[PDB]
Amino acid sequence: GDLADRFAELERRYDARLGVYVPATGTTAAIEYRADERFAFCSTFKAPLVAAVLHQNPLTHLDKLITYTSDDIRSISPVAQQHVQTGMTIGQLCDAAIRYSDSTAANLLLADLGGPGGGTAAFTGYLRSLGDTVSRLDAEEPELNRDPPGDERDTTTPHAIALVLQQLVLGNALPPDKRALLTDWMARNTTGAKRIRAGFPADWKVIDKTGTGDYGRANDIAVVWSPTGVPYVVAVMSDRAGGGYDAEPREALLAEAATCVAGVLA
Known about the structure:
Layout: H1 3-14, E1 17-22, E2 31-33, E3 39-40, H2 46-55, E4 65-66, E5 88-89, H3 90-99, H4 103-113, H5 120-129, E6 155-156, H6 158-170, H7 176-187, H8 196-199, E7 205-213, E8 217-225, E9 231-239, H9 251-265
Antiparallel strand pairs: 1-2, 1-9, 3-6, 4-5, 7-8, 8-9
Helix pairs in contact: 1-9, 2-4, 2-7, 3-4
Enzyme class: hydrolase
Subunit structure: Monomer.
Domain Beta-lactamase class A catalytic: 19-237
C-alpha cells in the first residue's frame, strides 16, 4: 500500500493541499507528505511562542501581571477580551494563547520577547536556535493568517515545525519543568477536538495546537502517546488555496489525515 496515494486522495476529495510530517524513531519510519513545502503557521506558532518565553525567563516570570486595553484586542481573543480591567499574568497569557488560540495573548507574549516587528523577529530567532532555518514570522495577529499563497512570510514547513515540537515536548530544548508546563497547556487545548484528536483512538493521549487562516488554512501540530506510552510528533498542515482567500478550512481533512497516520503508527 502507499500512504502517499491515500494523502493524495484526501487532497482530491477536500480540494486541498496537505502537508504531513511525523519524525522517524528507532522503531518507525518518518511519515512525510509535502513535508518541505511551506504552509502558513497561523496559530500553530503560539506553541513555540510560549516555549520562547519560557526559554528566556525564570518560571517566576509567569506571575508577572500584564495590563492592556480594549484597543489591544485582536481577532480572536476569547480570554484576553474578558480581562481588560484585571490584566492577565504571563502564565495566564500562555494558557490562553495555547488553549484558546488567544491572539491578544500571543501578541502580548511577542511583546514580552520584544524587539523589532513587535517580537516577530525574536520569535523567528528562537526557531533559528532550534535548528529551523526555513520558518519565519513576519506579522503579528491577525495579519499573520492572511498572506497570499506562495508568500514565504509567516510560513513554516511540516518538517520544520514537527522537529521544533519534537525538541520542545520530547527533547531537551526546555528544562523538564518548563517542558511540563508547555506540555500541560497543549494537553488541555480546547480548540482541537475535530482535528488530530478526532483521528486517533481514545486510548492515545493527544496534546495539540491548532491554526486556522485565510485560503482555507487549517493546521494542527500534536504530540501523541500510544496506549503503551510511546510518543510521536504529528504535524498536519493544510490549505484550500484553490478556493480563494475565503475558502473554508476543513477540520475533517486534518481528522482524516490523522486517521491515516494513526493507522500507520498503531
